[PDB]
Amino acid sequence: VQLVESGGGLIKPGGSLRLSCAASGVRLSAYDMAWVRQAPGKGLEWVSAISSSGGSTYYADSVKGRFTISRDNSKNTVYLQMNSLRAEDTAVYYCVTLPDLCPGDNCTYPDASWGQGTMVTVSSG
Amino acid sequence: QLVESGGGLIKPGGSLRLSCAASGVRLSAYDMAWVRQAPGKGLEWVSAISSSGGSTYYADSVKGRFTISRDNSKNTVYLQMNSLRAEDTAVYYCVTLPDLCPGDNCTYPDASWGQGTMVTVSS
């Protein structure tokens, strides 16, 4: 399984960007997916997550209302729409799968994975 | 905040048991996991455990060598690492796994990430 994020870059405060993550080697539908970020000088922080079906989602309070996570399993891609960006949203964004838990070693789930990350810089002047 | 301990220096082939405790967060109510980042490498999943502790996950590189467990009476989570080698040297983070809301307005507490602790496999 391999995750590759794209859409990162430089944008002015107030802007909107859509990050995407394509999975290869395993159908994306097998995974509940999530976005994690790490701002300069800060620890890692959960941003958003979405179930394999797309019916359940998670959002950190810091981005609630401005960010929307979605997915297109047919394209094996997950997205993170980021609106009304702020300087504090500057960080490396990672797309990751969420572990599938098993009662004992009796499952045949595909392995979990982490993307390489993509930088998002919200600045001006 | 989540705080990891029990790391540090360990000789090759040795064992360490990492612990994670938290202040302002009730760990027993969350599925938990361990993530690591070796020098010059990207972050990667290590292991995970259900809130009840009945279900688990292990990355291929550590399965059979590591054991994740938890004590919900002390609200702590552990990761016993055995047969440690150079590739296991890394910063280890304990994290809660996000609660997914089937719609909007659920009342789950926010997810959190530990600060991480260094594990150095050296003689």
CATH architecture of chain A: Sandwich
The Rg value of chain A, from CA coordinates, equals 15 Å
Largest interface here, residues on each chain?
A-B, 31 and 33 residues
**Contiguous helical run count of chain A:** 0
**Strand order, largest beta sheet of chain A:** 2-10-9-4-5-6
Biggest β-sheet strands, sense, barrel of chain A: 6 strands, mixed
Number of domains of chain A: 1
Shape of chain A: elongated
C-alpha termini separation of chain A: 40 Å
Look at the structure and give the CATH class of chain A. Answer: Mainly Beta
Derived structural class of chain A:
mainly beta
CATH topology call of chain A = Immunoglobulin-like
Helix content of chain A: under 10%
Helix-strand string of chain A = EEEEEEEEEE
The count of strands of chain A amounts to 10
Strand share of the residues of chain A?
35-45%
How would you name the CATH homologous superfamily of chain A? Answer: Immunoglobulins
Oligomer: homodimer
Descriptors for this entry?
0% helix; mainly beta; 125 residues; elongated; homodimer; six-stranded mixed beta sheet
